[PDB]
Design an enzyme around this catalytic site. Structure first.
Site, PDB file in Angstrom:
ATOM      1  N   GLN A  29       0.827  -1.219   0.000  1.00  0.00           N
ATOM      2  CA  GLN A  29       0.000   0.000   0.000  1.00  0.00           C
ATOM      3  C   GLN A  29       0.860   1.267   0.000  1.00  0.00           C
ATOM      4  O   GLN A  29       2.041   1.216   0.366  1.00  0.00           O
ATOM      5  CB  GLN A  29      -1.186  -0.004   0.990  1.00  0.00           C
ATOM      6  CG  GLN A  29      -0.895  -0.607   2.344  1.00  0.00           C
ATOM      7  CD  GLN A  29      -1.158  -2.080   2.432  1.00  0.00           C
ATOM      8  OE1 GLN A  29      -0.238  -2.884   2.394  1.00  0.00           O
ATOM      9  NE2 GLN A  29      -2.411  -2.458   2.624  1.00  0.00           N
ATOM     10  N   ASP A 144       4.220  -2.586 -17.349  1.00  0.00           N
ATOM     11  CA  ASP A 144       2.936  -2.562 -16.647  1.00  0.00           C
ATOM     12  C   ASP A 144       2.139  -1.297 -16.873  1.00  0.00           C
ATOM     13  O   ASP A 144       1.547  -0.742 -15.952  1.00  0.00           O
ATOM     14  CB  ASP A 144       3.109  -2.917 -15.144  1.00  0.00           C
ATOM     15  CG  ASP A 144       1.866  -3.494 -14.459  1.00  0.00           C
ATOM     16  OD1 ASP A 144       0.954  -3.974 -15.171  1.00  0.00           O
ATOM     17  OD2 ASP A 144       1.809  -3.467 -13.209  1.00  0.00           O
TER      18      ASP A 144
END
Ligand SMILES: c1cncc(Nc2ncnn3cccc23)c1
Lengths: 302, 287
Positions: A29, A144
């Protein structure tokens, strides 16, 4: 910044600090942080790591390819380890330039009808392409490109997420490396099949992903969303190039998608060629788009 | 209801990362009030999820009650400050001796004795037989999901479990889509192939193709002949057991019940000693 060392794993004391209170149980996170010496804000990816993984992280950092900074890349500031006593796990920090307005995916999700205006798609797609052009010339493949990895600053500047791309640091921590990730933005050449047994990335793989991101901006989701990932993996090399569902889009936009989505990477245009495409090259409302995006940011911030 | 789930503050503390059932991380958790150990699978609740975790918790409490499946204790929600998703904490039985992958990596020569492989393989098959009779496919049998308690009891974890593909090395040919198999079928027998790959992993320290990039392994599994043990030291019964698990066409692969009757699994006269020998190893591994 004066105290940045991308080649070593260091304690963050006196360099970066978290501003948000980070609890127990981190696995990637992102928290608001700050550069101690300048006061400049930073994005900090936090992961709980074993003592063994730390030794491995050290080697991966030595392999980091280097490149100057660029206005379309959220600057990677390094890797840090915040020590805990033996037995209890330490935390790896991956530090990046802070981008306040969130991702391109959040932007489309927050937009009415989960569709962005065409001139916004052209602006965002150009900034992605400029970011990619910079990585590609430095012999770096992003790997990505997707809406979640394309961010907006408060001033509607477009930045590619860089938490150490040239050594895929964020996709290796909790053994996420042995895993095939999400397949929806994957180019046909990155998937192994009879004619392509050595599923090898090329710079051009980022361009296919950029085209999938443009469809994501246009429809709120990539073409093969909700399909089991193994089935999407079978369909990508087999299906015709994805195309926009709606007839509302301009011919230039359909043309831009055809450029990105050439299935055979050997025939797919380079980043420089796509930058010359009329959909990207001709943006007369560029000043207004930034203003329009900046208003959408300030209005959602309440 | 999901709202009934309490905060873990003052109840459980996360000590260290032990595994990964991805979604999220697995922690050795220490019960604050009693000092007792538990495994905590921590995951961000997007919600979104709602039904997803509700049915995971439902199948965790429903099927955790078999000696070969790690038992489900309960769940907690760690309320997160605004701008971040809340965390779901699934509290499970802590299997003190770790995974069979760790066991083999800690063993000299990265190879387990044949009678240990027979014992572990039988317990995996008994765990699978329980899930299969309840119409549940594990879907992720591998050394990392097969654990040992301190008393050398064998327990299965992370069963019945989504836009990403995990690691492919233990995948059966039918779960991988190709020209002849476009649907990528999951059958109870897919777990049996994975069980055979786990037996090779116990024997050699790694599954076949561990070298290969995951995408290449994915292409090779349906094409390559059934994997086989590299060393000639193994008994014919063990080679025979592997041939049974590793029938590429799932329609021709034996059932869990048939594999339980295989001589390698069925004939274990040193069963009492194996448990003693395994307990000895795990208690020895303390440094
Ligand atoms: C659920 C889902 N995926 C992994 C786990 N791993 C563990 N669970 C229990 N004890 N233990 C000891 C060491 C590792 C584990 C659980």
């Amino acid at each position: 910044l004066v105290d940045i060392d991308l080649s070593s794993l260091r304690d963050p004391a006196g360099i970066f600090e978290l501003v948000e209170v980070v609890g127990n149980g981190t696995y990637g996170q992102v928290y608001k942080g700050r550069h101690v010496k300048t006061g400049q804000l930073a994005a900090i990816k936090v992961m709980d790591v074993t003592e063994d993984e730390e030794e491995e992280i050290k080697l991966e950092i030595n392999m980091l390819k280097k490149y100057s900074h660029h206005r379309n890349i959220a600057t990677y500031y390094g890797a840090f380890i915040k020590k805990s006593p033996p037995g209890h796990d330490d935390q790896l920090w991956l530090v990046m330039e802070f981008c306040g307005a969130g991702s391109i995916t959040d932007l489309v999700k927050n937009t009415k009808g989960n569709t962005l205006k065409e001139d916004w798609i052209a602006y965002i797609s150009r900034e992605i392409l400029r970011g990619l052009a910079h990585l590609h010339i430095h012999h770096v493949i992003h790997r990505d490109i997707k809406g979640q990895n394309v961010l907006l600053t408060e001033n509607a500047e477009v930045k590619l997420v860089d938490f150490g791309v040239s050594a895929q640091l964020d996709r290796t921590v909790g053994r996420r490396n042995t895993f095939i990730g999400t397949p929806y933005w994957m180019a046909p050449e990155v998937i192994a099949c009879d004619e392509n047994p050595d599923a090898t990335y090329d710079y051009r793989s980022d361009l296919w992903s950029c085209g999938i991101t443009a469809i994501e901006m246009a429809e709120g989701a990539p073409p093969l969303c909700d399909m089991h990932p193994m089935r999407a993996l079978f369909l990508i090399p087999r299906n015709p190039p994805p195309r926009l569902k709606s007839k509302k889009w301009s011919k230039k936009f359909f043309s831009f998608i055809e450029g990105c989505l050439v299935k055979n990477y050997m025939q797919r245009p380079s980043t420089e060629q796509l930058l010359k495409h009329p959909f990207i090259r001709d943006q007369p409302n560029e000043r207004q788009v930034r203003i329009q995006l900046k208003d959408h940011i300030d209005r959602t911030r309440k």
